[PDB]
Design an enzyme around this catalytic site. Structure first.
Site, mmCIF file in Angstrom:
data_model
loop_
_atom_site.group_PDB
_atom_site.id
_atom_site.type_symbol
_atom_site.label_atom_id
_atom_site.label_comp_id
_atom_site.label_asym_id
_atom_site.label_seq_id
_atom_site.Cartn_x
_atom_site.Cartn_y
_atom_site.Cartn_z
ATOM 1 N N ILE A 42 7.811 -7.507 -2.789
ATOM 2 C CA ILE A 42 8.842 -6.477 -2.785
ATOM 3 C C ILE A 42 8.627 -5.350 -1.777
ATOM 4 O O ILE A 42 9.518 -4.531 -1.562
ATOM 5 C CB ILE A 42 8.970 -5.834 -4.171
ATOM 6 C CG1 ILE A 42 7.686 -5.080 -4.516
ATOM 7 C CG2 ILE A 42 9.270 -6.898 -5.212
ATOM 8 C CD1 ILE A 42 7.814 -4.159 -5.690
ATOM 9 N N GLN A 57 7.220 -4.417 2.135
ATOM 10 C CA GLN A 57 6.690 -4.673 3.471
ATOM 11 C C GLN A 57 6.591 -3.405 4.319
ATOM 12 O O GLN A 57 7.482 -2.550 4.307
ATOM 13 C CB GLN A 57 7.501 -5.750 4.194
ATOM 14 C CG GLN A 57 7.135 -7.166 3.777
ATOM 15 C CD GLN A 57 7.664 -8.211 4.736
ATOM 16 O OE1 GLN A 57 8.468 -7.909 5.617
ATOM 17 N NE2 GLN A 57 7.214 -9.452 4.571
ATOM 18 N N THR A 75 3.110 -1.046 6.562
ATOM 19 C CA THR A 75 1.704 -0.984 6.964
ATOM 20 C C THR A 75 0.811 -0.459 5.836
ATOM 21 O O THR A 75 -0.357 -0.127 6.053
ATOM 22 C CB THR A 75 1.515 -0.127 8.235
ATOM 23 O OG1 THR A 75 2.495 -0.498 9.214
ATOM 24 C CG2 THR A 75 0.118 -0.324 8.823
ATOM 25 N N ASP A 130 1.669 12.763 1.041
ATOM 26 C CA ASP A 130 2.571 11.757 1.581
ATOM 27 C C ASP A 130 3.931 11.793 0.875
ATOM 28 O O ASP A 130 4.462 10.763 0.474
ATOM 29 C CB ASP A 130 1.939 10.366 1.479
ATOM 30 C CG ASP A 130 2.515 9.385 2.491
ATOM 31 O OD1 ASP A 130 3.209 9.842 3.430
ATOM 32 O OD2 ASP A 130 2.272 8.162 2.345
HETATM 33 C C1 LIG Z 1 4.655 3.159 0.555
HETATM 34 N N1 LIG Z 1 4.669 2.520 -0.751
HETATM 35 C C2 LIG Z 1 5.439 3.196 -1.799
HETATM 36 C C3 LIG Z 1 4.714 3.060 -3.130
HETATM 37 C C4 LIG Z 1 4.389 1.599 -3.381
HETATM 38 C C5 LIG Z 1 4.020 1.361 -4.813
HETATM 39 C C6 LIG Z 1 2.858 1.829 -5.432
HETATM 40 O O1 LIG Z 1 1.896 2.512 -4.755
HETATM 41 C C7 LIG Z 1 2.638 1.563 -6.780
HETATM 42 C C8 LIG Z 1 3.577 0.872 -7.536
HETATM 43 O O2 LIG Z 1 3.350 0.632 -8.855
HETATM 44 C C9 LIG Z 1 4.745 0.428 -6.932
HETATM 45 C C10 LIG Z 1 5.789 -0.312 -7.685
HETATM 46 O O3 LIG Z 1 5.652 -0.568 -8.893
HETATM 47 C C11 LIG Z 1 6.931 -0.719 -7.020
HETATM 48 C C12 LIG Z 1 7.068 -0.441 -5.666
HETATM 49 C C13 LIG Z 1 8.309 -0.813 -4.949
HETATM 50 C C14 LIG Z 1 9.473 -0.854 -5.712
HETATM 51 C C15 LIG Z 1 10.694 -1.146 -5.122
HETATM 52 C C16 LIG Z 1 10.747 -1.369 -3.751
HETATM 53 C C17 LIG Z 1 9.592 -1.294 -2.980
HETATM 54 C C18 LIG Z 1 8.365 -1.002 -3.572
HETATM 55 CL CL1 LIG Z 1 6.897 -0.922 -2.540
HETATM 56 O O4 LIG Z 1 6.110 0.255 -4.987
HETATM 57 C C19 LIG Z 1 4.958 0.682 -5.585
HETATM 58 C C20 LIG Z 1 3.384 1.111 -2.341
HETATM 59 O O5 LIG Z 1 2.180 1.877 -2.401
HETATM 60 C C21 LIG Z 1 3.954 1.247 -0.932
#
Ligand SMILES: CN1CC[C@H](c2c(O)cc(O)c3c(=O)cc(-c4ccccc4Cl)oc23)[C@H](O)C1
Lengths: 301, 251
Positions: free
Chosen positions: A19, A21, A23, A133
């Site tokens: 879910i 993508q 860096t 961030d």
């Molecule tokens: C930059 N980034 C945002 C936070 C992300 C992240 C977390 O750090 C921790 C998490 O538990 C989640 C999650 O449950 C769902 C999603 C998520 C949900 C919907 C679309 C895209 C994403 Cl990446 O992201 C999560 C990951 O660190 C990358």
């Protein structure tokens, strides 16, 4: 071949979808093989890691284990086979919602989003931690409509002895004026600047100050917040970067998108230039924006 | 939450026991690994805190793993390497390996840093750090008795000398005992003040209520325990050559 009572193999979860993508690595939705409980699996990156387990990942893990709150994302455990961080799954991110043109925000739902977010900052700052961030993509929301502050990869502990904290933090667009002026002695106010940007974003759908470099950002900030002079920000000239680029009104530009006056007012106290004069989590949660009709309501849109 | 605290019966039935190692030999192997940590620690110029954290990692590691499969001389350097990263004083992998080598093989010669032999003993340390992390279930945040020592040495208006003796007792409990596996840091800190007081002949004044100085530190602590623990700590200190000398009043 070795006993491992407290680090379960990630095979206990079944991946469903990649879910995330970017860096930051790879984020997977997964499903506990026995209970169906949904989780987020975030693999720990090992590109060019020649010092063993990455010190930055230790930091992040240290912080996640400490921060336990309704509005901070929840680390459940850490898994092996390579190493995975396992969170309670959050179906949405605020960036994705803000972009889907089919998604609509009632003002009482916007109030609630900002309330949960500000409550999360109040919590992490009380625990001596800076997020560093802030941005839409790092604000998550669960299926049941609970907002979670996430991604503590740049996060860092703070305190109060002249601080020697690092300068290149926060993505450009949500980076606050201090950092651009080269500041190294800062704290919680940098995160609230981000909250300000995110809050405006709830109405504009788009990040409001889309700078190209550090100086085009600072420029864009001036064409919204006024010039950066010691009349507005006492002793700002005490910094050796006021050199360039110099230049000599926030409620105006946002009038169209944001109708509520209390909303506009709060946005203006968050997007303040002097950190010492920037509104904090406590006073923000107390702003009349959260205590006038429509009242904050639960999320279902 | 009670995961890393063990009863005396559990300390008896250790992983090292299941493989033959006697109770007194095991205590010995921990004391040796602590010494190795303190030695590498001072040469790498890290703090007593970084070292204490390393020692607790080692202690907990051997409540899950056995000394017959994981030699302390292999584990300690990796534990120190991890603790330094966790505690803010990162040391480079090559640097920790050079220092481990000179401590363990004082007369041997630093191997060619290009050899397939050396490359391997670098990989071995990175493999062990990973094994330590997984064994500890990634719980690397350690509370030490020292934190609580300043809290209750102002509570007895103790001289600078009494305080420094209490830290010495604290650091020595980690090297010499397994209190860190049986008692919370606040309790261990009381044991350390209580014995520093006995040793210095400093007597504590009865509080205004009638209660005693330690009550304002941990509700669980009772004099019956403090005396049993300070006695056990004292006995081991007496068996340890030259240690008591360091806090001994020669005047
Ligand atoms: C930059 N980034 C945002 C936070 C992300 C992240 C977390 O750090 C921790 C998490 O538990 C989640 C999650 O449950 C769902 C999603 C998520 C949900 C919907 C679309 C895209 C994403 Cl990446 O992201 C999560 C990951 O660190 C990358």
């Amino acid at each position: 071949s070795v006993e491992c009572p407290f680090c379960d193999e990630v095979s206990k979860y079944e991946k469903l979808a990649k879910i995330g993508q970017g860096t930051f690595g790879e984020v997977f939705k997964a499903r506990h093989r026995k209970t169906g409980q949904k989780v987020a699996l975030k693999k720990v990156l090992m590109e060019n890691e020649k010092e063993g387990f990455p010190i930055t990942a230790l930091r992040e893990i240290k912080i996640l284990q400490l921060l336990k709150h309704e509005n901070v994302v929840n680390l459940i455990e850490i898994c092996r086979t390579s190493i995975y961080l396992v969170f309670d799954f959050c179906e949405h991110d605020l960036a994705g919602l803000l972009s889907n043109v089919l998604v609509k925000f009632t003002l009482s739902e916007i109030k609630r989003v900002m309330q949960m977010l500000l409550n999360g900052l109040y919590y992490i700052h009380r625990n001596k931690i800076l997020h560093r961030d802030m941005k839409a993509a790092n604000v998550l929301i669960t299926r049941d409509g609970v907002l979670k502050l996430a991604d503590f990869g740049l996060a860092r502990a703070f305190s109060l002895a002249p601080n020697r904290y690092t300068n290149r933090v926060v993505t450009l667009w949500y980076r606050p004026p201090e950092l651009l002026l080269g500041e190294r002695d800062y704290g919680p106010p940098i995160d609230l600047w981000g909250a300000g940007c995110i809050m405006a974003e709830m109405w504009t759908r788009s990040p409001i100050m889309q700078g190209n470099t550090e100086q085009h950002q600072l420029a864009l900030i001036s064409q919204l917040c006024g010039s950066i002079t010691p009349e507005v920000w006492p002793n700002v000239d005490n910094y050796e970067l006021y050199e360039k680029l110099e230049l000599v009104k926030v409620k105006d530009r946002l009038k169209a998108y944001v109708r509520d006056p209390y909303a506009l007012d709060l946005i203006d106290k968050l997007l303040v230039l002097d950190p010492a004069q920037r509104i904090d989590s406590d006073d923000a949660l107390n702003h009349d924006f959260f205590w006038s009709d429509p009242m904050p309501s639960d999320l279902k849109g | 939450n009670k995961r890393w605290y063990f009863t005396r019966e559990q300390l008896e039935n250790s992983p090292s026991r299941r493989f033959g190692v006697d109770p007194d030999k095991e205590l010995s192997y921990r004391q040796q690994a602590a010494n190795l940590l303190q030695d590498m620690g001072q040469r790498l110029n890290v703090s007593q805190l970084t070292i204490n954290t390393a020692i607790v990692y080692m202690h907990r590691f051997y409540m899950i793993q056995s000394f017959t499969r994981f030699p302390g001389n292999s584990v300690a350097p990796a534990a120190l390497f991890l603790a330094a990263k966790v505690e803010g004083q990162p040391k480079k992998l090559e640097h920790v390996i050079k220092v481990a080598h000179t401590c363990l093989h004082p007369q041997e010669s630093l191997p060619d840093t290009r050899s397939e032999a050396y490359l391997q003993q670098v990989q071995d340390l990175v493999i062990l750090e990973s094994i330590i992390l997984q064994t500890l279930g990634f719980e690397l945040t350690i509370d030490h008795p020292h934190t609580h020592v300043v809290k209750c040495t102002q509570l007895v208006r103790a001289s600078k000398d009494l305080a420094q003796t209490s830290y010495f007792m604290a650091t020595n409990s980690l090297h010499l005992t397994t209190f860190s596996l049986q008692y919370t840091p606040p309790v261990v800190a009381c044991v350390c003040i209580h014995l520093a007081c006995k040793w210095s002949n400093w007597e504590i004044p009865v509080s205004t209520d009638g209660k005693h100085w330690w009550e304002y530190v941990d509700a669980t602590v009772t004099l019956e325990l403090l005396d049993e623990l300070t006695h056990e700590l004292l006995q081991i200190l007496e068996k340890t050559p030259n240690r008591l000398k360091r806090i001994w009043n020669w005047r």
